[PDB]
Ligand binder design. Structure first.
Ligand SMILES: [Mn+2]
Ligand SMILES: [Mn+2]
Ligand SMILES: [Mn+2]
Ligand SMILES: [Mn+2]
Lengths: 290, 290, 290, 290
């Protein structure tokens, strides 16, 4: 099993010097760095090549997370937005092909964060999204990318809140490059059973995000890690596990992730490194081959 | 230990014939019905005495929950909003005295639901709220009402997200009628420890809301009910336990609680009744004595 | 699911007036009374018919538990003990036919309690037991009795300590009416996973005994009841659930179950009744199909 | 917090070259090797100083476990056995002083393994044991040794089965060098609450043994490690944590610990080393700094 961390653990904006984080997580012993998609459209082919060379040089696999804007919303009733969204993903998936990235994850069926004052048309957004994702999935297959649909808690999204809804959506899309993605933080709110949710996802599970109930690094909170390892073994999980911890106030990250107290308890960069490496040791030990 | 349920388990709007729910809940064997404050300011003295007489006649204690409007925001930097809020609560608390209600709970330090797009000033809102609540507390004392501040998950408020923040706030207020209120749904997201959060609240714990991780009736989900029972025994909790299950899509309640799937699994009124009664037997059994 | 309790919860010896306990458990709302086999060989035909009629008239199903003596040890290297053991079981099973009982459970592959000072030959005892049990199973089948092999913790037997070992033994026996019986008390010691153990048992699970870690009535201890409910649903469990609580010091039951402190906390008969009824309500609610 | 492991994890007899295991556990990063007391009475003064020199040289602290024989039974009604027991402990405690060992633990109030076929006089054995242990405590105080009384499950002893019984016994002994010792394996059977047992022990807790429910190395089983870390922080635990895993059949160890299946799943010495090191990383990470 391959283990990663989201760069945003260290950063307060949805961009960074990803080369700095490739070198860091390689030293800490991770297999994977997850990076935000949003700066990638601002990269020259030179910058893409040198990011790929950095990843290759440090023995790191890159995965991509994206929180789509309202303008990138494949579910939108406005056919202009759906057309611009499809263009955005087509460009992005081609960048991912040049980057040697084989996995993108997030609320890719919708947008994030969402405007909850808007009138909700779940059945309408659902039907439009399935159609749109099925189209985008043809580009994802051409670019060698797993298009992973993140199951989110009710506060962040209305379309897909449980593993069962995720399986329903992906089954309805009916394309090999579209996968369910589960997140221990999101499962913690919506699911009756964590092991049950993972077994429900079964062969459709393409990615797993990890974090404690309050998004601390895995190990010292209430997430049932042993039950998760057992369920991953039950479904013969052939895929990666990326921890997505957020312990710092401030910036767009602190605001979007709604960190309103110092969850890090005054941690400096070296303290964040030590706890990430401890969480990685824990994750390899507890989650692997049951 | 007294056990209650929120009328809203059965209803898709923030008011109802509370007399109907007093009779139902009395027959199901509850001690307490929790009602929404919203319609109480508009009750004639006749309507108040009718509700009180109905509660007394059925052996049911009434408690009150409130989601304050933006106009009722005691943390507001706008002094006219603060003035309205203080007048609103002063009138409400006089009515609760007439109604023979001795407990109100909710985001009473702030408002709910909140506009999260607005720039956040936590320090400013905190200092203003502490001052505002301390004033309202003196009217709460006169009216014999425990003014209980609900600790909420980061998605619903930024001010008080943990039992420790709740205790810090309530100690700063420094008034005996102002209490911390915990909710298993909210603790499930923000707390390192459920038992730890309860022991942290200790003497300041004035009210407890219950529900599964996804707001189903207590019993068949992942909430550590036994650990809660033990912590309530540890602190010597002398308060009441009110379940706050939300399993129904539709209406303002469905929208505000963000129920985007049929969590009830097609339950009619009779089925909701039986599940509430089973959850009550479970709650009396698992949460008491320890 | 059908729910039972072992009479011995109320009694300090391996016999009693079972008619008294049939009437008690019918009143408390149980489906099943489990009784000890020990006195049954000393029942006249009319005593058997009386017990059967008492059970039938009260809507109660009788199940039988047996701790075999050294002289009833089907695993014994001594061929005379094996011969006497088979004659004992043959007579007992014919008595169970007269009683209209269709389930016997316990360490029926061995004896209980065992002498652990003896040199252990697990390999030899296992081979003899599979052979012996296969022969007795044919008598059980003719009598309409399921022969359920209890998986026990290491302190009570050496042959079958895990669900996997139980499955291995029952597969070797290769008789349809020979089943694995799991016990929450025994699984709590020996199993990596409770849900895993139940899913390992699968179609071989013919009976389930319940009790907290320290053998209190189900509900207020550390046994993961929700996980058990989920696993029973996963395997489509068709059988019954009998709680086997032991909370009283004194006599052969006190000594054999090794109760060396008052686990009942001074409970009189009415208190034992009420705790059993609360555990039954808990068990129906929490274990019932997910 | 100092972490150790019992040498017997690697060995099937109650002795070995302790210097070999000092070197090994130093290499694996342990602070402590726990050793069996059995061979220490057979040690010359030169051998004591050798082992002390090896320990100091490798930066390892030595702790001692003892399973008393029947003739070392401080609870015995036979005053000759009590006389011999006190002589045995007086000599052992003087050797410990020379070895530079400041902690001994086990069923030091009784013996292990016990003959459970004997008539049990719990009240008598308790009264004698308290008096006997109080006298030995004077010698322990002189030799600078913490005399740690292991709380055991009902299958291994009848005197002290819970942390509460442990505290009552130690408080009755009323001596600063006599401590309660808890074991995750034994707590897992007898305790209503793991956190609650540790908080019950509080200031009396002198030593903690760790192991999964079935005595595997900590981390991948059902023991609530986070809850343990929390309770240790609550009582400000000043002591060490020694893992006591037993995963191998064969010899006196296999027999006494009742390992009747290959729990090690065919692990060689190298594999046992790796799993102990994984469990140490897990234990340092999860059990500290709550
Ligand atoms: Mn995520
Ligand atoms: Mn609430
Ligand atoms: Mn049993
Ligand atoms: Mn031990």
């Amino acid at each position: 099993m391959k283990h990663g961390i989201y760069y945003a653990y260290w950063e307060q904006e949805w961009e960074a010097d990803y080369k700095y984080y490739i070198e860091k997580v390689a030293k800490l012993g991770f297999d994977i760095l997850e990076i935000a998609a949003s700066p990638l459209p601002f990269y020259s082919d030179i910058q893409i090549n040198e990011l790929k060379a950095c990843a290759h040089g440090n023995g790191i696999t890159l995965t991509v997370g994206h929180g789509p804007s309202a303008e990138q919303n494949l579910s939108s009733p406005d056919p202009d937005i759906r057309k611009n969204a499809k263009a955005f993903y087509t460009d992005l998936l081609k960048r991912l092909y040049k980057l040697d990235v084989h996995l993108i994850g997030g609320a890719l069926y919708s947008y994030w964060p969402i405007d909850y004052t808007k009138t909700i048309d779940k059945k309408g957004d659902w039907e439009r999204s399935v159609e749109s994702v099925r189209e985008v999935a043809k580009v994802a297959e051409a670019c060698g990318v797993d298009f992973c649909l993140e199951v989110l808690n009710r506060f962040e999204n209305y379309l897909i809140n449980t593993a069962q809804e995720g399986v329903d959506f992906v089954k309805q899309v009916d394309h090999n490059n579209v996968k369910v993605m589960l997140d221990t933080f999101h499962m913690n709110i919506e699911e009756d059973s964590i092991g049950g949710a993972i077994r429900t996802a079964g062969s459709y599970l393409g990615h797993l995000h990890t974090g404690e109930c309050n998004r601390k690094v895995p190990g010292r909170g209430r997430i049932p890690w042993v039950e998760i390892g057992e369920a991953l073994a039950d479904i013969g999980y052939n895929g990666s596990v990326v921890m997505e911890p957020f312990v710092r106030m401030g910036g767009t990250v602190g605001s979007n992730i709604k960190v309103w107290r110092d969850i890090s308890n005054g941690a400096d960069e070296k303290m964040l490194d030590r706890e990430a490496q401890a969480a990685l040791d824990f994750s390899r030990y507890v989650l692997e081959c049951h």
